[PDB]
Design a protein around this ligand. Structure first.
Ligand code: HEM
Ligand code: HEM
Ligand SMILES: Cc1cccc([C@@H]2C[C@H]2NCCO[C@H]2CNC[C@H]2Cc2cc(C)cc(N)n2)c1
Ligand SMILES: Cc1cccc([C@@H]2C[C@H]2NCCO[C@H]2CNC[C@H]2Cc2cc(C)cc(N)n2)c1
Ligand SMILES: C[C@H](O)[C@H](O)[C@H]1CNc2nc(N)[nH]c(=O)c2N1
Ligand SMILES: C[C@H](O)[C@H](O)[C@H]1CNc2nc(N)[nH]c(=O)c2N1
Ligand SMILES: [Zn+2]
Lengths: 407, 411
């Protein structure tokens, strides 16, 4: 019932007790492990509400106190009467931060307590959503000195009235399928891009076209808006030693900001809750540039480096992969946009695991997502055993709305 | 029941039915995943069902399920278990069982090769000297002057668990480690403890950076005894780099034969506690782990120094640059000497084809993602994007605690 995690590099052993507060199902049984799988009523609500408020009042050193019980009562009366309830601001800030703290797939949680929360619960239209979003983008970007933030729109009601940001991230590049057969821009977005023009976007049909936001307010058909160009901070990609690099015409955006997830606090569901921090270098350099299904530029780069591409064992993919990543780090650093390397990020996360075991009795961590997609075993997280379990408040992946929604 | 795995690069979706034949526990629950935890005397009562499952499997595979031959063998094994409380595998059973332990090993990326395995039956062995000779012939046949062949040697099964055969080495060929009084280590820090046991047992240590350890062999539950593998039998490759002429002066070399000797082989409920097996290396096991783990030879600093990389900031990716170069050197050195080796690109592509063939032909392929994805260049290999199900089939290879912890010393 109490569980050990060992680091095989340092021999440090940690004891996890936090997992018995785990509630949700993980996808694994005694018979099958699904560690590597990407997607494994009034009655139901008050347990959830109670459980959250209990942890809330516990964290403010006020468990079992008058203010505590009074709130539990107020919330109970409200559920019994209205079919749901409203979070107080303090609870909302606590909820959001803890959802980040519980995010087992996030390497950057050392930062979890420094999260600016924008309460957009008074929002009522998509124009309103647009306005809240621009302000988020601008506050977070901060001329390159990036700041963690989240913006929280109205919670689920009867479920026919959801708020949703159709985009998967606030800022992403367009993708178009061409007559010659290939793909221009980002192949991850062909589908969404198509829906954009189908709803009326004047696509420039270029390679690095910042997509338009598609916002659904109050379960209504979604609407189009361009983020003011001057709010999207982009970085042109150059190498500190390879002068030809620039000529590939590579840029990326400074602000990673995930906008398809669902935040669950005390059993209430916030379906639109874009959040943003700052990039770990490998995310652009390894995944966005080098994935076969993405920009897929290894071949081009290896060529310019005059490497032996005749056989896999010359490790030309690997050599090129590293330089592409050196270039992403250099560029962001030279233009003074916050970015973190995988060595630094994973080191910070180990320090953070130690803190969470010391101070909380554990840290849910998903090793498959935490170990970077390059140079795994030279980073310390490779050698660290992790327990993965689901705590609330949480972030949850939700299905692309277009698959669902009717017009 | 059905279970789907998707590949996120190709969108290819596979369907696993084989997990339905899964027995042992994983260590995971509906509330906790332990997929990244390294580690998550048998009664008559429990043995006949395990013999029965296995022989049902064996006879299905040779297309004789339900034959007289099958039914007679069931009855015969039933009888041995009744009378002697264990049983003996036929040669054909042992061979099939050893091949399947490999096939079922979910942490092994090399399984496209599972059906080409040389089985050396050493179940007539009685002494450590006998074990030494069996092991020598294994090393020599497996090496084959650089053209490596997969092989396994199987010593007699557990009886009362008081008479176990064990190879105390974790691999047949490994380098010594020596802790210095200043706190540093000479040779392989991974083998310090075992090196000490060897020294305590009588070995005269050369005290160099690349000393091949002596075998330490237990037969019949007896205290183990030391033997030196004939040096002419230990094929080694000096490490050099194709463009960097200074690389050779680092002094590195490595052995050609990866041979795991610390695992327990389970077949039809029988336990084979000494069963060293060997294949050939994937380059990253040497170049990433052996040389670049901080707890191992740890040559990163030294390589980047000589490369004159900028080492003031981790964000120069100097560690990453040195890593690739060392791994280029390993593959180059092995290929130049005609010693079998496989790079991680080729090994993972081959594994993905094996996996797909396995889903078509068998209804699944249990796979441990954490172990199968290489420890460098993760996502530029096709396995990174592959969903995998991990579960446990028999026959199988299981981890054993080191014998020096459990062994009853006789004197
Ligand atoms: C401040 C710097 C941050 C760093 C360096 C960072 C690091 C990362 C990385 C590298 C990933 C992998 C994403 C992928 O592979 O697509 C990730 C995932 C994630 N992070 Fe963070 N994070 C940061 C801030 C945040 C914030 C502000 C939140 C929410 C408040 C958050 C919550 C999450 C969640 C829920 C995931 C999983 C997303 C998914 O399932 O696709 N992180 N984190
Ligand atoms: C033919 C060439 C082979 C290649 C390229 C290969 C590849 C690998 C690699 C790279 C590992 C992980 C090494 C580690 O992290 O310690 C591994 C693990 C393993 N392989 Fe293989 N393999 C081969 C042959 C074999 C053979 C002949 C067997 C037994 C018949 C085998 C059974 C295993 C087992 C049981 C593990 C997990 C070991 C553990 O838990 O420590 N493999 N394989
Ligand atoms: C807030 C923050 C900080 C640092 C970095 C980020 C980067 C932007 C986050 N990455 C976006 C790319 O996301 C794709 C790739 N990894 C899983 C997919 C998204 C995804 C897909 C599916 C099926 C499930 C799931 N949970 N996530 C975000
Ligand atoms: C047959 C064959 C072919 C190719 C490569 C091999 C590689 C050489 C074998 N690797 C040996 C070093 O092994 C350490 C490091 N990876 C797991 C540990 C051993 C280990 C430790 C623990 C706690 C559990 C476990 N199951 N294995 C074998
Ligand atoms: C199937 C496998 O889980 C999938 O490719 C994962 C692996 N690890 C990952 N890790 C991160 N951070 N992000 C990802 O998108 C993935 N993809
Ligand atoms: C903690 C974690 O399970 C451990 O470091 C694993 C990760 N992946 C591995 N993969 C392989 N092939 N071999 C290993 O020894 C390990 N070690
Ligand atoms: Zn699991």
């Amino acid at each position: 019932r109490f569980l050990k995690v060992k680091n095989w590099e340092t021999d440090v052993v940690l004891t996890d007790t936090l997992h018995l507060k785990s509630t949700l199902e993980t996808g694994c049984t005694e018979h099958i492990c699904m560690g590597s799988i990407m997607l494994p009523t009034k009655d139901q609500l008050f347990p959830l509400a109670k459980e959250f408020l209990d942890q809330y009042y516990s964290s403010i050193k006020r468990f079992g106190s008058k203010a505590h019980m009074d709130r539990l009562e107020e919330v109970n009366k409200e559920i019994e009467s209205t079919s749901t309830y409203q979070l107080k601001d303090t609870e909302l800030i606590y909820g959001a931060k803890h959802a980040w703290r519980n995010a087992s797939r996030c390497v950057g949680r050392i930062q979890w307590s420094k999260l600016q929360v924008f309460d957009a619960r008074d929002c009522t239209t998509a124009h309103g959503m647009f306005n809240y979003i621009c302000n988020h983008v601008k506050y977070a970007t901060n001329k390159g000195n990036l700041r963690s933030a989240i913006t929280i729109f109205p919670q689920r009601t009867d479920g026919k009235h959801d708020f949703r940001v159709w985009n998967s991230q606030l800022i992403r590049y367009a993708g178009y399928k061409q007559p010659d057969g290939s793909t221009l821009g980002d192949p991850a977005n062909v589908q969404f891009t198509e829906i954009c023009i189908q709803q009326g976007w004047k696509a420039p049909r270029g390679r690095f076209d910042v997509l338009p936001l598609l916002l659904q307010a109050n379960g209504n058909d979604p609407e189009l808006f361009q983020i003011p160009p001057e709010l999207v901070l982009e970085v042109p990609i150059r190498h500190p030693k390879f002068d030809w690099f620039k000529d590939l015409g590579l840029k990326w955006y400074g602000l990673p900001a995930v906008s398809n997830m669902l935040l669950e606090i005390g059993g209430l569901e916030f379906s639109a809750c874009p959040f943003s921090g700052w990039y770990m270098g490998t995310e652009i350099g390894v995944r966005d540039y080098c994935d076969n299904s993405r920009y897929n530029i290894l071949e081009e780069v290896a060529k310019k480096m005059d490497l032996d591409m005749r056989k896999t064992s010359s490790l030309w993919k690997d050599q090129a992969l590293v330089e592409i990543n050196i270039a992403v780090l250099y560029s962001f650093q030279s233009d003074k946009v916050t970015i973190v390397d995988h060595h630094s990020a994973t080191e910070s996360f180990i320090k953070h695991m130690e803190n969470e075991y010391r101070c909380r009795g554990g840290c849910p961590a998903d090793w498959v997502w935490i170990v970077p997609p390059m140079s795994g075993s030279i980073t310390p997280v490779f050698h660290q055993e992790m327990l993965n379990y689901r705590l609330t408040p949480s972030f949850e992946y939700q299905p692309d709305p277009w698959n669902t929604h009717v017009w």
